[PDB]
Design a protein around this ligand. Structure first.
Ligand SMILES: O=C(O)c1[nH]c2cc(Cl)c(Cl)cc2c1-c1ccccc1Cl
Length: 133
């Protein structure tokens, strides 16, 4: 019952400072443009201890399956090969990605009827808001 309030299909409704976040991460111009246009659906499901997060869009489709606290490999939408760990901290899903001596953290929180996603790279934070589809 760990992630019950996250489970479902969520559609992106707003984004703020994603371009800057992507620049900070090292994403090149053309990928920033196309990725920034996308309005992904985020599909979250749980089966036993395994959480699956799918992102489906016109740009890319991604899928991760993981157990909380257990590191895994992920290829991101912008093609970084990262080592990821996702944990729950006070009801927030905290996703850290490590690659090339760098790190980024992505936090997913339920707030009212939205799922709010904060992505931080160094001093740059982006906020993406999703609503139920
Ligand atoms: O959804 C996400 O988890 C997500 N995380 C990102 C990190 C970076 Cl740096 C960039 Cl370029 C893009 C993404 C995406 C994304 C953005 C648009 C469509 C599909 C997807 Cl998957």
């Amino acid at each position: 019952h760990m992630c019950d309030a996250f489970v479902g299909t969520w559609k992106l409704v707003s984004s703020e400072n994603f371009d800057d976040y992507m620049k900070e991460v090292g994403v090149g111009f053309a990928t920033r443009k196309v990725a920034g246009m996308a309005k992904p659906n985020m599909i979250i499901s749980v089966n036993g201890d395994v959480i699956t997060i799918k992102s489906e869009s016109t740009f890319k489709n991604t899928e991760i399956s993981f157990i909380l606290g257990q590191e895994f490999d992920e290829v991101t939408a912008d093609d970084r090969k990262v080592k990821s760990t996702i944990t729950l901290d006070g009801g927030v899903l905290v996703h850290v990605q490590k690659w090339d001596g760098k790190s980024t953290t992505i936090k997913r929180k339920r707030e009212d009827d939205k799922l709010v996603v904060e992505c931080v790279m160094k001093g740059v934070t982006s906020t993406r808001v999703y609503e139920r589809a």
